[PDB]
Structure formats: C-alpha cells, structure tokens
Amino acid sequence: DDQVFEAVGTTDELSSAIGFALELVTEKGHTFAEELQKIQCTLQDVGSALATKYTTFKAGPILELEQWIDKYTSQLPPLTAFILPSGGKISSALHFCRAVCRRAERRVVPLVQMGETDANVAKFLNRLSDYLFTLARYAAMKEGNQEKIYMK
Amino acid sequence: DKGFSSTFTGERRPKDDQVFEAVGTTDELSSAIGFALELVTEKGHTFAEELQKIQCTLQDVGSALATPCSSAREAHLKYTTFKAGPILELEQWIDKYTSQLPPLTAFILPSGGKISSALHFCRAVCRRAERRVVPLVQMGETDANVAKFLNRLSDYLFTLARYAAMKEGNQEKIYMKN
Amino acid sequence: KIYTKTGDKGFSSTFTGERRPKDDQVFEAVGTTDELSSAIGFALELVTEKGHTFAEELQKIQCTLQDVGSALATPCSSAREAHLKYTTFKAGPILELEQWIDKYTSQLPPLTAFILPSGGKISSALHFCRAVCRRAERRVVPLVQMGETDANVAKFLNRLSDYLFTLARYAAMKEGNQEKIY
Ligand code: B12
Ligand code: B12
Ligand SMILES: Nc1ncnc2c1ncn2[C@@H]1O[C@H](COP(=O)(O)OP(=O)(O)OP(=O)(O)O)[C@@H](O)[C@H]1O
Ligand SMILES: C[C@H]1O[C@@H](n2cnc3c(N)ncnc32)[C@H](O)[C@@H]1O
Ligand SMILES: C[C@H]1O[C@@H](n2cnc3c(N)ncnc32)[C@H](O)[C@@H]1O
Ligand SMILES: [Mg+2]
Ligand SMILES: [Mg+2]
Known part of the structure; x- marks a missing residue:
C-alpha cells in the first residue's frame, strides 16, 4: 500500500x-550522541515493523525515551511558552529533526x-x-x- | 487521546487532519x-533580524491555523483575523534587496554559499507549507x-538567497539544458 | 516586481495554461522535486x-531535476486537451546515472548490513537527499x-x-x- 511506503520513507x-x-x-563522548544513535537503530526497527496482522513492536524504547526526557527536564528551567527554534547548530538541527519526526507520526x-501497525x-x-524538543533545549x-521567546 | 489531539477551539481530531499537517509544516x-x-x-546582519521576525510571524500563523473559523468564538477573534501588515513588510524587504541585485535573466540552480543554499531549502519548505x-x-477555515x-x-527567501x-x-550556478 | 500576486488566492498555472489549486498532485510533485x-x-x-567529479555530477543532476519539474508540470491529458506536443522525457540521464552508479559501486567494499545514515557531513547529507528523493518518487x-507524466x-x-546511496558510501x-551498522 502507498500509505505504508509513505510511513517508511518518512521514518x-x-x-x-x-x-x-x-x-x-x-x-x-557526549552521552546524547549515544542516545541519538540508539534512536536511529530503533527507527530502523519501526521501519521494519511498518512492513507487514501487524508485527509486535517492543515497548522498551518508549520507557527509555521517557527516562531520558525526565533526565534532561531535571536540569532545565521551567518553560511555559513557545520558543523560537534556535540555540546552536545542534539545537537547530534537532528542532528540524523534531518537526520531521512529527510528520512521521502523522504518516x-x-x-x-486501521490496525496495520502496532500502536x-x-x-x-x-x-x-x-x-527531541527537550534535548534541543538542553x-x-x-x-x-x-x-528566544516571542509573545504578543 | 493517542492518535488524536485538539485544536485551540476544542475540536478533537485525528492527528492526520489537514490542520495538523498545516501547522506541522509551518x-x-x-x-x-x-x-x-x-x-x-x-x-549584526539585518536579515538575521528579518528571518527572526518571520519566525515570529510563523508562530502567529500557527495560532491562526489552529483556530478554525467554523468554531471560533468571540475571544478567538484576534487569531482568526490575520492582519496583512507582515505581508507588506515582506514586499518592502524584497524591494530593498532587488535594488541591490543585478537583473535576473536565467534560471538559477540552488547554490551560492551555505546561507544561500539553506535559504533555497527554506523556500522549498515554505512552498510545501503553502500547499498544505x-x-x-x-474551505473558509483560515484567513486568506x-x-x-x-x-x-x-x-x-529567493531574493534573500541571491543577496x-x-x-x-x-x-x-545557472540552469543549462542537456 | 518579481511577484505577481496571481497566487494569492490559492491557484496557480501548469505549463499548459491550465489553472489548478496549489494543492494539486502536479504541484506536489513539482515542489518535492x-x-x-x-x-x-x-x-x-x-x-x-x-574539483571533485561527484560535485560536477550533482550539479548536473540538479539541471536534470529542473527538466523533471518542467515535465511534471505538463500533464499529458491537458496536452491533448490543449493540442500541445507530447512532452517526452529522454532516457539519457538514467543511463548516465547507471554508469556513475557502476563506477562507485565497483570501488567500495560490499555490504551485507543495514547501515545507519552517517559517515561524515557529505555522507549524511547525501542520505538526507536520498530520503527526500524517495519522497519525490512517491509523489x-x-x-x-494516471497517465499524466512519462514513466x-x-x-x-x-x-x-x-x-545518492552509493555516492554516500563512496x-x-x-x-x-x-x-555505523546495527
Ligand atoms: C523496509 C525496507 C526499507 C525501509 C526501512 C528499513 C529499515 N529497517 O531501516 C527504507 C525505506 C528505510 C529502506 C531503505 C533502504 N533499502 Co530497503 N528494504 C526494506 C525491506 C522491504 C525490508 C527490510 C526490513 O526491515 N527487513 C527486516 C529487518 C530485520 O531486516 P534485517 O534482517 O536486519 O536484514 C536485511 C538486510 O541485511 C538486507 N540484505 C540482505 N541481502 C542484502 C544484500 C545487499 C546488497 C544489501 C544492501 C542488503 C541486504 O535484507 C535483509 C532483509 O530485509 C527490504 C526488502 C526485503 N528484503 O523483503 C528492502 C531492501 C533490504 N532494501 C534495499 C535497498 C536497496 C535499500 C536502500 C539502499 C535504498 C535507497 N536508495 O534508499 C536503503 C538503505 C539505506 C539505509 N540503511 O537506511 C534492498 C537491498 C538489496 C540491494 N539491491 O542493495 C532490499 C532487499 C530491497 C530490494 N528488493 O532490492 N528499505
Ligand atoms: C497549535 C499548537 C502547536 C503548533 C504551533 C503553535 C504556534 N503558535 O507556534 C505546533 C504543532 C507547532 C506546536 C508545537 C509544540 N507544542 Co503545541 N500546541 C498547540 C496548541 C494546540 C494551540 C497553541 C496556540 O497557538 N495557542 C494560542 C497562542 C496564542 O497561545 P499563547 O498565548 O502564545 O500561549 C500558549 C503557550 O504559552 C502555551 N504554553 C503553555 N504551556 C506550555 C509549555 C511549553 C513547553 C510550550 C512550548 C508552550 C506552552 O500555551 C498557551 C496557549 O496555547 C496548544 C494547546 C492549546 N493551547 O489548546 C498546544 C501546546 C501549547 N503545545 C504543547 C507542546 C508539548 C508542544 C511541543 C513541545 C510539541 C513537541 N514535542 O514538539 C512544540 C513546541 C514548539 C515550539 N515552542 O517551538 C503543549 C504545551 C504544554 C506542555 N504539556 O508542555 C500544549 C498545551 C498541548 C498539550 N496539551 O500538550 N504546538
Ligand atoms: N507553493 C507551491 N508549491 C509548488 N509549486 C508551486 C507553488 N506555487 C506555485 N507553484 C508552481 O510553480 C510556478 C511558480 O510559482 P510562483 O510562486 O512564481 O507563481 P504563483 O505563486 O502561481 O503566483 P505568484 O507570482 O503570485 O507567486 C507556478 O507556475 C506553479 O507551476
Ligand atoms: C502542540 C499541538 O500540536 C498538535 N499536534 C499533535 N500531534 C501533532 C503531530 N504529530 N504533528 C503536528 N501537529 C501535532 C496538537 O494540536 C497539539 O496540541
Ligand atoms: C527498500 C524497500 O523500499 C521500498 N521502496 C521503494 N521505493 C520507495 C520509495 N520511494 N519510498 C519508500 N519506500 C520505497 C521497496 O519496496 C523496497 O523493498
Ligand atoms: Mg515568481
Ligand atoms: Mg507564488
């Protein structure tokens, strides 16, 4: 199906x-570089999962991500508004990665x-x-x- | 919900709605x-300031796209109506750069330094957002x-790349047949 | 002025004079290209x-992609509705691409594994180019x-x-x- 190819291509x-x-x-030696590489592997795993009545996708990485997210928010000031994408070359590319990822979620x-892929x-x-958002901030x-925050 | 999420007016739609593709591409x-x-x-480059103003304006279009006119109450009015001011700004800035550029006479390929290339990429992404x-x-749901x-x-973005x-x-680099 | 404002209400032109809404499949493929x-x-x-050769080859691919855009913007059905020519796409560039693919393929260690996008800035950048290129193919x-664009x-x-994939490996x-593998 063309929907599946679109999901796999966007992933x-x-x-x-x-x-x-x-x-x-x-x-x-940056720990978040190790984390991003683990995410790349997991992404290869979701690409495999999408090509199948649907295959079982381990829930392990979801907990891993949540743990990492708590790790970084513990070091961050409370954010209460929309930030403009910026904050170093790494942070900017990560916000672009974030948006691409949300496109993947929509696909x-x-x-x-429809029941063709594990929730x-x-x-x-x-x-x-x-x-990706919390990491950019970190x-x-x-x-x-x-x-930079904009409000009006 | 999982698979679902909300608009600023409270409509709960599946994450692949036209509005979610719109605001996500924005x-x-x-x-x-x-x-x-x-x-x-x-x-100190003034166009850095201009691109930041555009980022703000885009957060504003994000709010406008997240408030459908069909469900917008009165409090939401200041978001459905998108004043044309930023548009005029763009026109002015383009005129500013055009007076400083040589006359364009051929098809340009995306090129001309890392900033220029990044701006050509941004332009293509911008046109995808326009399509979304x-x-x-x-449909009558967002200000024209x-x-x-x-x-x-x-x-x-095109004239800025050139500048x-x-x-x-x-x-x-200029387009060359064959 | 370089802008006309004839697109301000959501409509635009194909190369046959037709006027379609900006969200039409031809405009989606032209944009993705x-x-x-x-x-x-x-x-x-x-x-x-x-003076890298693969830089010359990429700039050439860019020109060929301009020609792709032109073709995609000339749907064959409107071509026979508008008494226009046939608007063909030649096989030259494909054969050239196949030649370059062979030239790089023959120089790198075979691969049995699935690789993660990486390998330096050029390499990873070309892998991104590869994913976008696939999206264009899918558009x-x-x-x-439907019979609107030459196969x-x-x-x-x-x-x-x-x-692009073999050039990234190269x-x-x-x-x-x-x-990196996994
Ligand atoms: C889904 C899929 C994709 C998805 C997602 C894959 C992922 N997990 O990240 C996407 C779109 C990303 C993709 C990309 C590519 N893929 Co693909 N893909 C597949 C598919 C349908 C199944 C892969 C899968 O998930 N299998 C399950 C997981 C667990 O596989 P795996 O056990 O770890 O092992 C695989 C590899 O070792 C591979 N393998 C076996 N023999 C060979 C030989 C060669 C030369 C290579 C390169 C690989 C290879 O096949 C195994 C089974 O899929 C297969 C077709 C098939 N085999 O039925 C093609 C296939 C593996 N892909 C292929 C190709 C060509 C590619 C790309 C190079 C295409 C491109 N130009 O982008 C890239 C690879 C770059 C990368 N590493 O990111 C070819 C490989 C053979 C070849 N001719 O090189 C296959 C066999 C398709 C085909 N019939 O030609 N692909
Ligand atoms: C449309 C929408 C978006 C659009 C863009 C909107 C825009 N203008 O740029 C997109 C898809 C881009 C988006 C992205 C994100 N958003 Co959003 N978004 C919304 C939504 C539905 C309406 C936003 C809006 O335009 N409000 C109107 C404008 C005018 O409000 P505002 O005065 O400027 O004030 C808003 C902000 O202060 C925001 N705010 C409150 N708490 C927080 C916390 C954080 C961390 C942020 C960034 C903002 C924020 O709430 C106010 C009212 O919406 C709201 C939910 C809602 N409000 O019903 C969620 C919401 C604000 N988003 C949220 C999140 C999580 C995000 C993302 C981090 C998602 C992600 N993981 O990438 C990013 C942040 C991007 C950035 N800041 O650069 C959360 C924020 C609260 C929280 N749980 O932390 C909300 C409340 C949704 C939710 N219930 O989870 N968003
Ligand atoms: N957002 C878009 N995405 C993809 N293709 C587009 C888009 N807008 C226009 N096109 C196509 O590209 C060509 C150039 O677009 P261009 O923006 O110059 O004109 P327009 O938007 O139709 O009108 P305007 O001059 O007001 O911009 C159009 O003739 C049409 O083929
Ligand atoms: C922050 C806001 O972004 C919207 N939203 C939720 N999921 C996605 C997605 N994957 N892509 C785009 N927008 C999304 C919802 O409206 C949410 O409230
Ligand atoms: C590697 C796998 O990718 C699939 N495939 C082929 N072309 C595309 C495309 N443009 N986008 C996404 N997936 C594609 C094939 O079915 C192959 O098995
Ligand atoms: Mg124009
Ligand atoms: Mg236009």
Whole structure:
C-alpha cells in the first residue's frame, strides 16, 4: 500500500536528518550522541515493523525515551511558552529533526487507526518528538545560548 | 487521546487532519529557517533580524491555523483575523534587496554559499507549507492572508538567497539544458 | 516586481495554461522535486576541496531535476486537451546515472548490513537527499499511474536514489569514516 511506503520513507527521512544532526557534534563522548544513535537503530526497527496482522513492536524504547526526557527536564528551567527554534547548530538541527519526526507520526497514525501497525509505533514517535524538543533545549543550555521567546 | 489531539477551539481530531499537517509544516518551515539562521557566522546582519521576525510571524500563523473559523468564538477573534501588515513588510524587504541585485535573466540552480543554499531549502519548505495551507483557506477555515503571506515569503527567501550569494561574492550556478 | 500576486488566492498555472489549486498532485510533485534539488544544492557546499567529479555530477543532476519539474508540470491529458506536443522525457540521464552508479559501486567494499545514515557531513547529507528523493518518487508515481507524466521521470527518480546511496558510501569511504551498522 502507498500509505505504508509513505510511513517508511518518512521514518527513513527522520533517521537521515538525525544522522546529519549527529555529524554536528564536535567533541566525542557526549552521552546524547549515544542516545541519538540508539534512536536511529530503533527507527530502523519501526521501519521494519511498518512492513507487514501487524508485527509486535517492543515497548522498551518508549520507557527509555521517557527516562531520558525526565533526565534532561531535571536540569532545565521551567518553560511555559513557545520558543523560537534556535540555540546552536545542534539545537537547530534537532528542532528540524523534531518537526520531521512529527510528520512521521502523522504518516503513521492512519496505519495505527486501521490496525496495520502496532500502536506502540505511533506512541514511540510521539514521545520521540518530546525527547527531541527537550534535548534541543538542553543543548542550547549547555552552550549558554539565549533561547528566544516571542509573545504578543 | 493517542492518535488524536485538539485544536485551540476544542475540536478533537485525528492527528492526520489537514490542520495538523498545516501547522506541522509551518513548524518545519520555522525550524528550517532556524538552522539557516544559525549559519550566519558574522553578527549584526539585518536579515538575521528579518528571518527572526518571520519566525515570529510563523508562530502567529500557527495560532491562526489552529483556530478554525467554523468554531471560533468571540475571544478567538484576534487569531482568526490575520492582519496583512507582515505581508507588506515582506514586499518592502524584497524591494530593498532587488535594488541591490543585478537583473535576473536565467534560471538559477540552488547554490551560492551555505546561507544561500539553506535559504533555497527554506523556500522549498515554505512552498510545501503553502500547499498544505491552501486547502484550509479555500474551505473558509483560515484567513486568506495566511496563504498570501506564505506566497510572498517564497519570493522573499529567493531574493534573500541571491543577496547572500552576492555579499559573499559567490556566483550562482545557472540552469543549462542537456 | 518579481511577484505577481496571481497566487494569492490559492491557484496557480501548469505549463499548459491550465489553472489548478496549489494543492494539486502536479504541484506536489513539482515542489518535492524542487526540494530535492535544493537539498542536493546544500550538500554540494559541504565539499571541503575543489574539483571533485561527484560535485560536477550533482550539479548536473540538479539541471536534470529542473527538466523533471518542467515535465511534471505538463500533464499529458491537458496536452491533448490543449493540442500541445507530447512532452517526452529522454532516457539519457538514467543511463548516465547507471554508469556513475557502476563506477562507485565497483570501488567500495560490499555490504551485507543495514547501515545507519552517517559517515561524515557529505555522507549524511547525501542520505538526507536520498530520503527526500524517495519522497519525490512517491509523489510522481501516482502521476504515471494516471497517465499524466512519462514513466521515465519516475524511473530517473528511482535510480537517483540508488546513485545518492552509493555516492554516500563512496564519500564515507574516501573520508575514512565508517558507516555505523546495527
Ligand atoms: C523496509 C525496507 C526499507 C525501509 C526501512 C528499513 C529499515 N529497517 O531501516 C527504507 C525505506 C528505510 C529502506 C531503505 C533502504 N533499502 Co530497503 N528494504 C526494506 C525491506 C522491504 C525490508 C527490510 C526490513 O526491515 N527487513 C527486516 C529487518 C530485520 O531486516 P534485517 O534482517 O536486519 O536484514 C536485511 C538486510 O541485511 C538486507 N540484505 C540482505 N541481502 C542484502 C544484500 C545487499 C546488497 C544489501 C544492501 C542488503 C541486504 O535484507 C535483509 C532483509 O530485509 C527490504 C526488502 C526485503 N528484503 O523483503 C528492502 C531492501 C533490504 N532494501 C534495499 C535497498 C536497496 C535499500 C536502500 C539502499 C535504498 C535507497 N536508495 O534508499 C536503503 C538503505 C539505506 C539505509 N540503511 O537506511 C534492498 C537491498 C538489496 C540491494 N539491491 O542493495 C532490499 C532487499 C530491497 C530490494 N528488493 O532490492 N528499505
Ligand atoms: C497549535 C499548537 C502547536 C503548533 C504551533 C503553535 C504556534 N503558535 O507556534 C505546533 C504543532 C507547532 C506546536 C508545537 C509544540 N507544542 Co503545541 N500546541 C498547540 C496548541 C494546540 C494551540 C497553541 C496556540 O497557538 N495557542 C494560542 C497562542 C496564542 O497561545 P499563547 O498565548 O502564545 O500561549 C500558549 C503557550 O504559552 C502555551 N504554553 C503553555 N504551556 C506550555 C509549555 C511549553 C513547553 C510550550 C512550548 C508552550 C506552552 O500555551 C498557551 C496557549 O496555547 C496548544 C494547546 C492549546 N493551547 O489548546 C498546544 C501546546 C501549547 N503545545 C504543547 C507542546 C508539548 C508542544 C511541543 C513541545 C510539541 C513537541 N514535542 O514538539 C512544540 C513546541 C514548539 C515550539 N515552542 O517551538 C503543549 C504545551 C504544554 C506542555 N504539556 O508542555 C500544549 C498545551 C498541548 C498539550 N496539551 O500538550 N504546538
Ligand atoms: N507553493 C507551491 N508549491 C509548488 N509549486 C508551486 C507553488 N506555487 C506555485 N507553484 C508552481 O510553480 C510556478 C511558480 O510559482 P510562483 O510562486 O512564481 O507563481 P504563483 O505563486 O502561481 O503566483 P505568484 O507570482 O503570485 O507567486 C507556478 O507556475 C506553479 O507551476
Ligand atoms: C502542540 C499541538 O500540536 C498538535 N499536534 C499533535 N500531534 C501533532 C503531530 N504529530 N504533528 C503536528 N501537529 C501535532 C496538537 O494540536 C497539539 O496540541
Ligand atoms: C527498500 C524497500 O523500499 C521500498 N521502496 C521503494 N521505493 C520507495 C520509495 N520511494 N519510498 C519508500 N519506500 C520505497 C521497496 O519496496 C523496497 O523493498
Ligand atoms: Mg507564488
Ligand atoms: Mg515568481
């Protein structure tokens, strides 16, 4: 079906964007680079899961992401408004990765609502967007960059 | 719910609604512009300020797209009506750059320095957003000025790409048949 | 002024004079093609040094993608409704792409594994180009199922994805980056 190819291509697109983003880390040894590579592998797993009456998609990564998300929010100031995308090359590419990921979630949702894919796949992509947002904020913080908010 | 989410007026729709594709593509555009902006190394450039104003305006179109006219109460009025001011700004800025650029006579390929390339990418993403917003406008659900703004933003990003290539002294590649 | 405002109400022109809404399948394939070309254009500027052959090949693909856009914007049905010519797409670029694919393929270690997009900035950037190129192919195949666009256009997008993948492996190899596996 053409819906499935669209889901798999958009998940591929997400993974490739994360790959480019990762190439933006200058110093090695950053734990979130390890996390982004684990996410790339999980993304290959959701791409396999989408091609099938639907295959079982392990719920493990969902908890992993949630744990990482709590880890980074614990170090961040409370955010209460919309931020403009910025805050270092890493943070910007991660916000682009975030938006691409939400496009992927929209491409997967019809398949889940039709019974052709495990709901855990959409749940994983939904939480992956929140992880991408919180991580962008954390990278901007660790570089000492503004985090510009607009309101009016 | 999972698979579902809400509009600013309280309508709960499945995550693949026209409005969610619209606001998400508006988000993708704002973020592409964000990376492009992180590519200006030298500070004080006025077009950095312009791209940031555009990011704000885009957050405003995001609110407009998330408030359908068919469900907009009175309190929501200030979001359904999208004043045309930002559009005029774009027109003015384009005129500003056009007086500084050589006359354009051929098809340009995306090129001309990292900023210029990033802006051509942003333009393509902008036109995708325009395609995702037009269905809402032609249905009566979002102010036409939003599509008008995105349509002019495509031309702004194009002339800005050209200006950046000029100021870096990089020469755009021209389309060549065969 | 360079803008006309004839698009301000959501409508636009194909190359046959027809006026369709901006969300039409032809405009979706033309835009996705436009986008792929711009992504290749940005990748083209991660080349550190001068005079790479694959940079010339990419700029050429860009030209060919302009020609793809032109073709896609000329739907065959409106071509016989408007008494226009046939608007063909030649096979030259596909055969060329296949040649370049062979040239790189023959130089890199075989691969049995699924690789993660990575391998340096050029490599990862070309993998992004590859995903976008596939999206273009997916936007074009409905147009050929309906008989509006020559099927060579789809085939060329499909061998362009193969070209970009093998070029990313080739860039990763020449850099000494190793593509990550899992
Ligand atoms: C879904 C799918 C995709 C999805 C998602 C895959 C993912 N998990 O990330 C997307 C769109 C991302 C994709 C991309 C690609 N894929 Co694909 N894909 C498939 C498909 C349908 C199943 C893959 C899968 O998930 N299997 C289950 C998981 C668990 O597989 P796996 O056990 O780990 O092992 C696989 C690989 O080792 C591969 N393998 C086996 N023999 C060979 C030989 C060669 C030369 C290669 C390269 C790989 C390979 O096949 C195994 C089974 O799928 C297969 C077709 C099939 N085999 O039925 C093609 C297939 C594996 N893909 C293929 C290709 C060509 C590619 C791309 C290079 C295409 C491109 N231009 O983008 C890229 C690879 C880049 C990358 N690594 O990201 C070819 C590989 C053979 C070849 N001619 O090179 C296959 C066999 C399709 C075909 N019939 O030609 N793909
Ligand atoms: C449409 C929409 C979007 C659109 C864009 C809207 C825009 N203008 O840019 C898109 C899809 C881009 C989006 C993205 C995000 N959003 Co949103 N979005 C909404 C929605 C449905 C309406 C927003 C709106 O335009 N309101 C009107 C404008 C004028 O309000 P405003 O005065 O400027 O004030 C708003 C902000 O202060 C916001 N706010 C309150 N708490 C928080 C917390 C955070 C972290 C943020 C970013 C904002 C925020 O709430 C106010 C009213 O909406 C609201 C839900 C709702 N309000 O019913 C969710 C909502 C604001 N979004 C939310 C989230 C989580 C996000 C994302 C982080 C999602 C993600 N993981 O990527 C990003 C943030 C992007 C950014 N800041 O750059 C949460 C925020 C609260 C929370 N739980 O943390 C909400 C409340 C939805 C929810 N129940 O989870 N969003
Ligand atoms: N948002 C878009 N996405 C994809 N293709 C488009 C889009 N808008 C226009 N097109 C196609 O590309 C061509 C150039 O678009 P262009 O923006 O120059 O004109 P327009 O938007 O129709 O009118 P205006 O001059 O008011 O912008 C059009 O003739 C049409 O083929
Ligand atoms: C923050 C707001 O974004 C919207 N929203 C929820 N999920 C997605 C998605 N995957 N893509 C785009 N927009 C989404 C909802 O309106 C939510 O309230
Ligand atoms: C690697 C797998 O990708 C699938 N495939 C082929 N073309 C596309 C495309 N444009 N987008 C997404 N998936 C595609 C094939 O079915 C193949 O098995
Ligand atoms: Mg236009
Ligand atoms: Mg024009």
